[PDB]
Each structure stands twice: as C-alpha cells, then as structure tokens.
Amino acid sequence: FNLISEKCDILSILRDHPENRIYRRKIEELSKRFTAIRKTKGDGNCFYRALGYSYLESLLGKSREIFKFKERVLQTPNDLLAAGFEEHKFRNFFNAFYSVVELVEKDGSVSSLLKVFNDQSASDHIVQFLRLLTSAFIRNRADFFRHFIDEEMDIKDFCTHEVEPMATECDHIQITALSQALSIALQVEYVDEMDTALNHHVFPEAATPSVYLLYKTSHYNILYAA
Ligand SMILES: *CC(=O)NNC(=O)[C@H]1C[C@@H]1c1cccc(C)c1
C-alpha cells in the first residue's frame, strides 16, 4: 500500500504528525464531515493517482454510473487524436485505464482496485493516461487555458513539459482540465486555513462531488465523507 494507503481515521492527521497540530481547528472541523483518509505517495503524481483511484472507487456497485463512465472512456482515443496524440503512443496507457474500468464494471472489490493502484507499473500507466487526457483537454481548448498561463509560455509547451511528463506537479489548470475531461465532480479541502492559494474546486455542501481530496503544500490525500 506504498502508492495508496488503507484508510486511516481523519484524526490520525493530528495524532501521528506534531507538525499538523497548528491546523487542529480545521482538521477537527473536517472530522465532523469526513471520517477517514487514504494517503497517496508524494511523487509528483499524487493528484492523478488520487483522483483516478478515488473516482473509480466511488463507482463500485453503481452499474448505471459505470456504464456512462465506460462510454466517456471509449471516446477518449478520439479526444487524444484530435489533440495530436498518435494511437501507437497512447495505446498501453489507454489499455491500463480501460482494464481498471472493466475491473470496476465486473463487480470489482475495493481490495482488487487498491491492488492495481498499488502496482507501480499499472498505477503509473493509469497516471500517464490521465496526464495525456489532461494535455488533450487543454490543447483542444487552448483559447480557454491560454488565460491561466504565462503569456511568454505556449499552451503546447505547458502541456509538453508540465502536464504530459510523469512526476510533474499539478496546479488548478490540470485539476480543472482532468475533472472536465472525465466529468468528475471533485471537491478539494485545505488542511491549512492560512494558505492563500485560490481554491477553484470548493462548492457549497448541497453539491454532490464524487471525490473529496485533502490538500496541503502540493499534496492531495483522499477524504471519505462521514
Ligand atoms: C501530488 C504530489 O505528488 N505531490 N507531491 C509531493 O508530495 C512532492 C513534494 C514532495 C517531494 C517529493 C520528492 C522530493 C521532494 C523534495 C519533495
């Protein structure tokens, strides 16, 4: 469980980490709404790996939701080609992601899903797929995403260097692109109330996110609603 941990009670964030006790107030509030966390490896990939795992986990047993998600996934090869990705280059990453979608579709357990996401090779192929889809999404909407980058930076160069490569850290750009790309309603909770970084992924309670992530200093763990 080196890439995605077993569940820990939310208050482990305080009990195990003296360094977090300054965030006691936020964590104790979150503990009213969320019961548990899974920890993700801090390797530059944690957003993609957290969102992939958490969303597929959210689908287990929801056969209609799985069906509609499989349809979106079967369309992604065309989105990738429209963005200039050749099939022979994305095939193995598509196949890894398709495989874990079929695992969830065929009754699939949390245990079997965790095993794929803790397999370095399978998990990193899934992350690479999610990175290419993120890049494809941004490239296809250069006009929109152009607003959020460095004027001197080309959108294609941003994607080449800050989205496609493994271990490249996310900003709100990649979170927006991937969530829109797969229609994953995501909510990000912050550990640190004093962190001023604008949150583009917090909505009112009445919204129905699939995935809740817990953010601190470039790192995203998975949250479980109470
Ligand atoms: C989401 C994600 O993977 N976040 N990244 C981390 O937690 C990276 C920051 C930590 C790290 C890894 C290797 C080396 C250093 C100096 C930091």
Residue numbers in the entry: 6 to 231
The authors write:
Ubiquitin thioesterase OTUB2, a cysteine protease from the ovarian tumor (OTU) deubiquitinase superfamily, is often overexpressed during tumor progression and metastasis. Ovarian tumor (OTU) domain-containing ubiquitin aldehyde-binding protein 2 (OTUB2) is an active-site cysteine containing DUB. Recent research progress revealed that elevated OTUB2 expression correlates with tumorigenesis and metastasis. OTUB2 can promote tumorigenic progression of non-small cell lung cancer cells through deubiquitination of U2AF2, stimulation of the Warburg effect, and activation of AKT/mTOR signaling. Moreover, OTUB2 has been identified as a cancer stemness and metastasis-promoting factor that deubiquitinates YAP/TAZ proteins in breast cancer cells, whereby poly-SUMOylation on OTUB2 lysine 233 mediates the interaction with YAP/TAZ. These studies demonstrate OTUB2 to be a relevant therapeutic target, and the development of OTUB2-specific inhibitors can potentially be beneficial for cancer therapies.
Here, we describe the development of an improved OTUB2 inhibitor, LN5P45, comprising a chloroacethydrazide moiety that covalently reacts to the active-site cysteine residue. For our best inhibitor, LN5P45, we solved the X-ray co-crystal structure in complex with OTUB2, and we conducted a streamlined cysteine activity-based protein profiling (SLC-ABPP), which revealed that LN5P45 selectively engages endogenous OTUB2 over other ubiquitin machinery components. LC–MS analysis of OTUB2 before and after reaction with LN5P45 confirmed the formation of a covalent complex by showing a mass difference of 230 Da, which corresponds to a substitution reaction at the chloride. The phenyl ring moiety points outside the protein toward the solvent and has as such no obvious interactions; there are no aromatic protein residues or arginine around the active site that could π–π stack with the phenyl moiety of LN5P45. The trans orientation on the other hand nicely positions the inhibitor inside the small groove leading to the active site. The carbonyl directly attached to the cyclopropane ring interacts with the side chain of His224 through a hydrogen bond, and the Glu174 side chain carboxylate also forms hydrogen bonds with both of the hydrazide amines. We determined the preferred absolute stereochemistry as (1S,2S), and the LN5P45-OTUB2 co-crystal structure explained the molecular details of the inhibitor binding mode.
